[PDB]
Amino acid sequence: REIVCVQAGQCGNQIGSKFWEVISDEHGVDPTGTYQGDSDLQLERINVYFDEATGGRYVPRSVLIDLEPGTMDSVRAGPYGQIFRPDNFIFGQSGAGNNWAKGHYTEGAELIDSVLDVCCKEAESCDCLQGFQICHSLGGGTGSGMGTLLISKLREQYPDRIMMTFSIIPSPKVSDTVVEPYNTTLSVHQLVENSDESMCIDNEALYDICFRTLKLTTPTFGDLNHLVSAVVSGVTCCLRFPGQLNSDLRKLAVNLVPFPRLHFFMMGFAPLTSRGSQQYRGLSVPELTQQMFDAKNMMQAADPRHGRYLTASALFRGRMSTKEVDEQMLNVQNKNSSYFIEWIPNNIKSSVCDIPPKGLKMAVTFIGNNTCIQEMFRRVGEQFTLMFRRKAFLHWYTGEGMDEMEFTEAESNMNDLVSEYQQYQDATIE
Amino acid sequence: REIVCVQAGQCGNQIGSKFWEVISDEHGVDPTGTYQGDSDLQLERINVYFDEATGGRYVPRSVLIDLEPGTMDSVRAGPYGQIFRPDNFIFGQSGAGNNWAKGHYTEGAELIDSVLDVCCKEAESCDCLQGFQICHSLGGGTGSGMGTLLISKLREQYPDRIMMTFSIIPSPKVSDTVVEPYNTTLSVHQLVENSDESMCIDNEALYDICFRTLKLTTPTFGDLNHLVSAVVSGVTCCLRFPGQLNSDLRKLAVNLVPFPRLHFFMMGFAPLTSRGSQQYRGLSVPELTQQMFDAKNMMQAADPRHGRYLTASALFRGRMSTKEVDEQMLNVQNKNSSYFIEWIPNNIKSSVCDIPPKGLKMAVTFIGNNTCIQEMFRRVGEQFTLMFRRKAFLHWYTGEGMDEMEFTEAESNMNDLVSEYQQYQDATIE
Amino acid sequence: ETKPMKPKTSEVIKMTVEGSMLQTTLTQLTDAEQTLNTRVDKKP
Amino acid sequence: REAICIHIGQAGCQVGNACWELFCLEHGIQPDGAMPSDKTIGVEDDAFNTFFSETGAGKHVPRAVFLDLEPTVVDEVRTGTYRQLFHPEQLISGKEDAANNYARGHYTIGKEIVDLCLDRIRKLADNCTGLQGFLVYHAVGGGTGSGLGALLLERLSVDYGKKSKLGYTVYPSPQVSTAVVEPYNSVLSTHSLLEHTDVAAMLDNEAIYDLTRRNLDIERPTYTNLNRLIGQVVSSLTASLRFDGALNVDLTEFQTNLVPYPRIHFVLTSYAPVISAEKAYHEQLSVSEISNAVFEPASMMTKCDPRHGKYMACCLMYRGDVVPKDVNAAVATIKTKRTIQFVDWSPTGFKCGINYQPPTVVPGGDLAKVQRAVCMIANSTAIAEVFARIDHKFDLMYSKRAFVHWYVGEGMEEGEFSEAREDLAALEKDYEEVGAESADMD
Amino acid sequence: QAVVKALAAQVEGNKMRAEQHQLEVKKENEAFCRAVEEERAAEAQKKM
Ligand SMILES: Nc1nc2c(ncn2[C@@H]2O[C@H](COP(=O)(O)OP(=O)(O)OP(=O)(O)O)[C@@H](O)[C@H]2O)c(=O)[nH]1
């Protein structure tokens, strides 16, 4: 049961580089590709993410795509860059220009056939294929446009598999680019139709995690990408190690999504705490659950206290009792009963895995489906409608060929998504 | 049955530092936090004040709050400061300005949510919670305003638990600040509604203890805080060790307070004696009772000879006979019968604990409910009325936002408290 | 082609939760505990 | 005398591991299947035959299959400690799970795996003298256990016909829960189980957690403890087939005595001397105290209180050195109690069994070693409360179609939900009607 | 006599495993303390 990864744009390639560092460390693969591990548990599921090349070697199931090769040359120059198969690198000759329409219609259609040829070459090699995993930002240009193009083609070609995306979205507090609202709105329009499950992270939340919890004096993008690589490698942990209560991406989707449009989730990871402070508080299942539900540990600007939990899932790694897990989930559901949607008798799924990440005694990853996400879409919509009424910078997109009707359609579809979340929020049973 | 301590302001943090030194010594905790004791009797109730952190360590269940970090940095720098959990230190970025209104309304509401979050995190971790214990001065700025704010919020959230306070009140003679009457009047108004039991200490009484009883040539605040830490650790001693006649904070409160407004008490501790004199007088139960009732040894400026005892309590530590305790309390009640309220047939509760404070063969702590406490409030109220008629310094408080009507309400409520005590002083059977 | 699964050793099985307490029954015993079970058929 | 064991899904395979650990240690088979020569007494009665078959070189192999849709648990069994005990053909594994969907197990995926399973079951059943039942272990809360368990029981019931099928079933606990979609799977499971099972034993994990906290002194129990208790119960019930005794009880005697009408086959189970070794020296353990113990609701392994209902039949299994006169005195004392009530149409409420083989002690185990034990399975109207609680949660979710699109996409008509809910309503009415007294007074 | 012998043997074995578990926990705590002391040396890197 093997996953294929796709990394698109600068953010995607950087997050991918840190992810493949974390996974290669976890399975004991040398940066030359030679297996040097020290337990059979590392070897026995290596197939899930690596293909085996001849006399020792392992190759990582990933496709790298970008519109200007500067980043790709940077990734090839990195410490693990040599591991990647050369034929898997796809790049063009001119940039996206921060324009969704260029990335989707002009340079997208120019490159897209070579990416589908490579993904099919990678997919047809699997003995049984599980879902794809894609990392990209929604505020950029080639990431948003070509990522959603590729997602649509893969959904046409593989409708029975899983399509999973992790996505970084522009913060209202601090933009790096002026035209972010257009790219975000069009990308959310593509995702709500195409995706099966999508996780959203705010860079502002990663900065607040680093400063308040880790107390880093001078954080860098490497730290943010380390938090992301930690969660990405955590969601898949039950795929590749034994445990007392196995779980799977499809089983998570079936338990988390009540209706097919409601597939946007908040993410958190609980035992983040510096090793020096860790001496002041011992690890235990109650301790993990309390940090796990603390809004300090959630990776989105919206706060749960303004919404209600529809569903939640917990994946535990480590040697622990099932009784303690079950009774903790009962006590949290009973004591905080106003924040849980009442027509479901138990909103939390649990899962337990035997093998923790190296150097931690225990860890949990949290996925939450909460109506307070309506906030991210509403904030973007105000900024978009502000821009669209004045036809702001619009000539760039229309000159590529877009009809103005696409913008009003995408706005209407996002507004209906906000309305569907808002109706279920209604705290009053009425 | 575990107590959570709160220390507020400079006085509170300093008293807390000396208290946690005495308690850590009594339970044999090294300044690194490791248990190094030599009898199981030390270990078997350590849970009452400490939580266990991973790999051996214990952490003390205390919250430290202050508005400017100078004091907090001083306590962290002290010899035991490292034991305290870093996250339990709460501080702002601008001072209370020695002003009650700032501490209650402007910086109070800014910080209070983080203090309530920490107190709830600490409280909800206990398997069964006994009352909270709070130490602060009323003459300061953040101590009075934010302490009474926090007491009101905790009384809203946990109305079935116990609320216990130790409180320092401004000397009529040794003032450090001109606007002391306002801070005292508003704080006593808050306490009489919120508190379950409140102990009052005059700094003048600690000076008279040091100079007259201990004959110290050059006393310092460390001695005053040692006397306070001795009584504070003594009231709870029966909670945490075995004995022939167990006692508890709730049993003291139920036996001392006849009616719910009458909850202000005097304190004393008996085996105080100078190192030169100590060679001249052995410990015995008559000696402890005689020192215990001597007004020289009482920690308030009001003298019992000007009032009447409603109720009294005695907590004895050490291996001693019950016969001597019972016969001493009968003999003292019979010989001084005019100073005891006649419609209660026996005013004194006794309790006996096997384990004395380190380096003493025997000790007793005294809690007294005496109407002469009314004299402190009346003297403070006269000076407040003197200042208010001339609207002294009033623009600071009105500029913060206070209605003048709060001052007349607080004055009326304090005056009614004085009247109620005076009425019970002069009550008769008829 | 699917490579056949390789058998585990003693310390590898001990890592998990089920296998550790299976091996506890199998190996970690005193001499007296192996005498506990016996057959009493046709005796009474 | 033979029995075939079928283990399906995760709970069923892990409970199988605990069961076969116990059956090995009780018979004396080593993990490699080689019976040792020093365990001999000159003659060796064929007591293993209920659970083992011989090749001819003297290796033992057990009459069981392990069925799963995900590989991890069965490859763990294949690579574990008992690798040489099981035949590799017996360990059957698919490619992908039923994803907590009963519909996925039953319609899309289980039809592919079911024919291999039936061929293996055929391969077991042709090599016996006379098969006298199937033992099945599963949970009704998960997708493959529900869907493939139903499909397999339907096919077994057509192919083998009248032959008995006995199920041990882990039902969803009344407030502990592990997945959101448990009510749909449990309702549809109970719907299939009504037609195609001869006796169904109901278990709740919350009760075994309460029993292990209260009686044993275990602060942090895990599934291996619960599975060891279940294995002990199964060993007690099947001991009557395998060892000498005063009053034997064949598996057909259970069905004849416990089931008054053909739908009323769901029974409660409890076990008496759950006791620690340190606890074991504080108490005598005579017949009458443990008989009094099995009737207290603190002893039950299902979360129902029988004081809120009426007993229809009781079956009491005593094993070890016990004498019939003490069993009779105990049963007469139970009958005297006022908080124990039998339906007036069932005057002779008890069946007794007495076996000489004492319960086995497992080296790592947490139960003490004891000379005698009693185990009970009993039919009572209190069971009606468990279905009502499952039905309320089903009604809550289905009123708004909270998750139905997964099930409808996987090949299922929307109508099947309403059919199952009406069948469980009719089962509730059956338990209401059977407990109604008939009056014939002028 | 047989039953009392069996119970005594079981109690002794329980004591043995309890002692072994305590020894393992003590070793783990010592290793944790050493590893905490090791990470303090990263304070010199910031200084230099
Ligand atoms: N007693 C006991 N119950 C278990 C065990 N494992 C899971 N359960 C319970 O069974 C239900 C979950 O069923 P599963 O066995 O995990 O479902 P499954 O057979 O694996 O089906 P899939 O998830 O599709 O593979 C829950 O109620 C769990 O509490 C176990 O080892 N022992």
Ligand SMILES: Nc1nc2c(ncn2[C@@H]2O[C@H](COP(=O)(O)OP(=O)(O)O)[C@@H](O)[C@H]2O)c(=O)[nH]1
């Ligand atoms: N977390 C993270 N965010 C990034 C990184 N690089 C860029 N971003 C963010 O992604 C957005 C810019 O998108 P970009 O990747 O340049 O789009 P592209 O030009 O199409 O590749 C901004 O919000 C950046 O803050 C990175 O390495 N990590």
Ligand SMILES: Nc1nc2c(ncn2[C@@H]2O[C@H](COP(=O)(O)OP(=O)(O)O)[C@@H](O)[C@H]2O)c(=O)[nH]1
């Ligand atoms: N008894 C005693 N009194 C103190 C101590 N520290 C300060 N005080 C008194 O408390 C008053 C000052 O209040 P302070 O604690 O500074 O208020 P804050 O600024 O809000 O913390 C003065 O009357 C001081 O004499 C102490 O350690 N012991």
Ligand SMILES: [Mg+2]
């Ligand atoms: Mg499963």
